[PDB]
Design a protein around this ligand. Structure first.
Ligand code: CA
Ligand code: ZN
Ligand code: ZN
Ligand code: ZN
Ligand code: ZN
Ligand code: ZN
Ligand code: ZN
Ligand code: ZN
Ligand code: ZN
Ligand code: ZN
Ligand code: ZN
Ligand code: ZN
Ligand code: ZN
Ligand code: ZN
Ligand code: ZN
Ligand code: ZN
Ligand code: ZN
Ligand code: ZN
Ligand code: ZN
Ligand code: ZN
Ligand code: ZN
Ligand code: ZN
Ligand code: ZN
Ligand code: ZN
Ligand code: ZN
Ligand code: ZN
Ligand code: ZN
Ligand code: ZN
Ligand code: ZN
Ligand code: ZN
Ligand code: ZN
Ligand code: ZN
Ligand code: ZN
Ligand code: ZN
Ligand code: ZN
Lengths: 401, 402, 401
């Protein structure tokens, strides 16, 4: 149920879909083609099912990392924007929407971790990681702590680990090299050691999670926290005078958080590919098009240079973009599952004292190959099931041989 | 123990073994060496078992795809024909008998898919795939269908898929590259799209198998079919005036069917390697030698250039050879099991509408990796079993270690 | 917990720990740093367990092949000896203590297979393998056999196999190549063929193991045997007049036995890295240092050039070194487990007549890959077990949550 001569668009419920419909309303007035915007529950899981059969939306809006799995399954169509339109967006955002050399989606919004500080407790935020231990002792005299952030998830701790030479997958020649993993290098060694040093010197607690860290900052117990744009609304409600700035540097090198890019992909089964190209390139990815969506729900930092400069007036957004350009793009390959599994264990075991930094990171490459073996055989058996599925419609109590 | 001084040959029961024995009788008259020709049941399965221990025949006759398995186990010997003898057979036939660079067998016969048409219904067969949809609805006015062939097996559907650039594995410098798979490329994409287009436009049924297609052509219900030389005898009995020609062209490019080559391999355990070479090169692979075998049971297209030119006077055999030269050789590598499994699913799902052309072909590497892992497990546990036999036969209940 | 200021060393119970303690006593007198030498049971098993948490010894003594697993886990520290000190030891010994390019331990002793002959029965030992069948016929008239050695283990049979062209994995500039396996090549083919020829010509029995071979030589039933320095003491007790010489040559090429190197590795978690370097380079690896250890329990051949020449005056030790230089270093890579499993089966089957030489070596790639995936399985399920247990003890309700 695609239906040619019209566009049906899928976008998550927490996004500005009403403003997107306004863009589609503008699109209808110029070309005479109606645009329907739908927001079904769990559309990221519904899409691969329906798009395989040849159904689903013409355009889908989701994070770029999930789009890699779609392009693997051949559900997304290769987009054809020329050199001039590619210059309209930030050059790095184009790397997020790439699979097997081909461009598969249009970058819309950019999301990344930033440093959030209490202005009343600390009007001058630190530029380096190394001055935070010294800052903690000075704030402990006033019954406060310098920095509290989520330590359970690798996503939050990676900016430090990365900062000086850490890397999950080496991005070279428009592709990720799965044979080159930078979790066991000297840069990642130093970053995690510094984090562990912060813990054993009582500057941070190893048991700290999202709930503990958010509550601590919103009550004004800690001076600084590391969080994304999604948490801004909760800090606004707590009346806390907060600022958002660039992440602290480690060994003179900037922190490298993972970059999440909200993207627009065209279904491969769609017979409205050139119409989707017209809508996305010339109606949505313009100053008006993004403004209409942003006013319904804030898009944060955007991929379009012209409108990003406009939004930059908000220093929070400017910091989101600055950390993103200093960070690295979330790899869209399936091998990322094994990476998260390995690094999560690595960080937890290093922080708790179960394993040393050198040993915890070394075991990560072993543990990553382990998840790979489980996954490579996980889908080997679901394939065996599907082979015996067809062996029931060919030769049975209905037709033999 | 394969008893030196004489030759023992294994060849399938459906082949011209009596004619081969006549070649052996001629060999015995010139050199004084007796030649035994045997045709045991399931000899393709019996060979790896007895050849490993040091037994079995001196020479074995089978299709080349099974010979890649025998070469892996090191059951076949490396043959040494000179440049002069290699020019006697078609250059491409030597690519079928190559494993790890070394030549392992002698090419004898050549099998490939061809286009078979009803002369009474259609005297002028289409040269392109693109003109078949238009030709169908003309024949549908007379209550007939243009083309009906097996769509369940990938072997039959591959010629179209391969045509524009699909491939199994890249063949370079006499070596297959298992990392270079061409099922997901644009050439294979267009081939399958056209096939799916034919089905949804009611020109073909998605659930058409071998039997339905064979029965339809033999009763004169369909104008065309795609099949090999093995099915000719059934069309002969049906009294249908049939012709065999080259496969249709897709996008100006020829169809590429897989080429099966009947080959003669020499056992590595054989003490009569010179006598096997002498018999195969100077006695069998001559006009006389192949004549005797062909008269007992037809070989189809042959590897020998001189005898093929004589057989090409039969327009059916000339068509089988023409399709083979245009097509690709069936890879002899073990990765082919994974290939067939994945492509079969890909085509079936694309034809039925379970998956789009793009999605079905994309899932092929994922489906091929499934067999790969499953074959690894299959040989992993059978290795563990035969290991535990070593530690229970040798080392227990009557001994400790020895 | 590795205390600082002092040194603690782990070395196996069957080694000269008392002599090593004397070196530590000398170290204490010059520097004022006390050295403790401990010999705990199954220290090779205990080291990976305690060194991962940050405990264990400062220095560990074991065979180099086990150290490859330690370097993978990041339990060993990279040693820093200059070019001048590297020239003090035999060049090849440094290749045994190398992992991923880095040097991970100090070579101490060298252990290799040698040809042991009864000089009463045979004063002139054969220099070639080819002349052994002719020698057996002469000795069978006197009711004796020419050669009897272990055939059940590949370690003993490999020297013959390797000599013409066999190799487990190709050693290059950096490390080992796990793709290039030389078990199926022509050189290894010929080597095993000759061994099978010896068995079917009734010169050797396929059922001969370590016990049968040792007993036959110590009673004086067989003229020759192939064994290491470990068996010398048993031949001493039997009063048999015996000599140790170079292994016979096959096709003019020397027999290539695997070389075992006893090595001293520094713990990565050690706070005494310079002190360990000082102790090992300047105190142990000297004429004086090794002599003390050698006098407690013999080291056999040594890595140090100066002390080896002095020990070479023993014809048995000089022969062990000569075979080692002609032979090949035992690979420290984990892929070796699969190699042993495959070759063990290949040789046994070829010797019993169960398979031909060609079919035996060809099947080796199959059962080597079979083990490879079988190890990947038990490694993968280790991860699952430790993951599901780590998430429960750190995430649950009952008694918590
Ligand atoms: Ca401090
Ligand atoms: Zn709809
Ligand atoms: Zn909804
Ligand atoms: Zn549909
Ligand atoms: Zn993500
Ligand atoms: Zn590179
Ligand atoms: Zn401090
Ligand atoms: Zn502006
Ligand atoms: Zn402005
Ligand atoms: Zn027979
Ligand atoms: Zn075949
Ligand atoms: Zn000739
Ligand atoms: Zn039509
Ligand atoms: Zn092909
Ligand atoms: Zn190529
Ligand atoms: Zn070429
Ligand atoms: Zn070429
Ligand atoms: Zn290629
Ligand atoms: Zn029907
Ligand atoms: Zn049938
Ligand atoms: Zn003739
Ligand atoms: Zn070709
Ligand atoms: Zn002194
Ligand atoms: Zn001194
Ligand atoms: Zn102790
Ligand atoms: Zn002890
Ligand atoms: Zn003899
Ligand atoms: Zn015994
Ligand atoms: Zn014993
Ligand atoms: Zn001294
Ligand atoms: Zn001294
Ligand atoms: Zn001395
Ligand atoms: Zn060497
Ligand atoms: Zn809970
Ligand atoms: Zn309980």
């Amino acid at each position: 149920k695609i239906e040619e001569g019209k566009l049906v668009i899928w976008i998550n419920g927490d996004k500005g879909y009403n403003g997107l419909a306004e863009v589609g309303k503008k699109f209808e007035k110029d070309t005479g083609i109606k645009v329907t915007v739908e927001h079904p529950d769990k559309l990221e899981e519904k899409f691969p099912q329906v798009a395989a059969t040849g159904d689903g939306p013409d355009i889908i809006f989701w994070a770029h990392d999930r789009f890699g799995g779609y392009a693997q399954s051949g559900l997304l169509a290769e987009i054809t924007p020329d050199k001039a339109f590619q210059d309209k967006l930030y050059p790095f955002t184009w790397d997020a929407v790439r699979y097997n050399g081909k461009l598969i989606a249009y970058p819309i919004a950019v999301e990344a971790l930033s440093l959030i500080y209490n202005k009343d407790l600390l009007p001058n935020p630190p530029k380096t990681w190394e001055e935070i231990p010294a800052l903690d002792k000075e704030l402990k005299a006033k019954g406060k702590s310098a920095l509290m952030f989520n330590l359970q998830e690798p996503y939050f701790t990676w900016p430090l680990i990365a900062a000086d030479g850490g890397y999950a997958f080496k991005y070279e020649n428009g592709k990720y090299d799965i044979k080159d993993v930078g979790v066991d290098n000297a840069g990642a060694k130093a970053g995690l050691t510094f984090l562990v040093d912060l813990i054993k010197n009582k500057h941070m607690n190893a048991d700290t999670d999202y709930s503990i860290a958010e509550a601590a900052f919103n009550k004004g117990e800690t001076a600084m926290t590391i969080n994304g744009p999604w948490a801004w609304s909760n800090i606004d409600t707590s009346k806390v005078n907060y600022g958002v700035t660039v992440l602290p540097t480690f060994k003179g090198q900037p922190s490298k958080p993972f970059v999440g890019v909200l993207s627009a992909g065209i279904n491969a089964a769609s017979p409205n590919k050139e119409l989707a190209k017209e809508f996305l390139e010339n109606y949505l990815l313009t100053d008006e098009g993004l403004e209409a969506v942003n006013k319904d729900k804030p898009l944060g930092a955007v991929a379009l240079k012209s409108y990003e400069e406009e939004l930059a007036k908000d220093p929070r957004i400017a910091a989101t973009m600055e950390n993103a350009q200093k960070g690295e793009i979330m790899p869209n390959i399936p091998q990322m599952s094994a990476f998260w599994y390995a690094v999560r264990t690595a960080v937890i075991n290093a922080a708790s004292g179960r394993q040393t930094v050198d040993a915890a990171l070394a075991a990560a490459q072993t543990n990553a190959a382990a998840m790979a073996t489980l996954e490579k055989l996980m889908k080997a058996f679901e394939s065996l099931k599907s082979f015996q599925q067809q062996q029931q419609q060919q030769h049975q109590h209905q037709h033999q041989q």
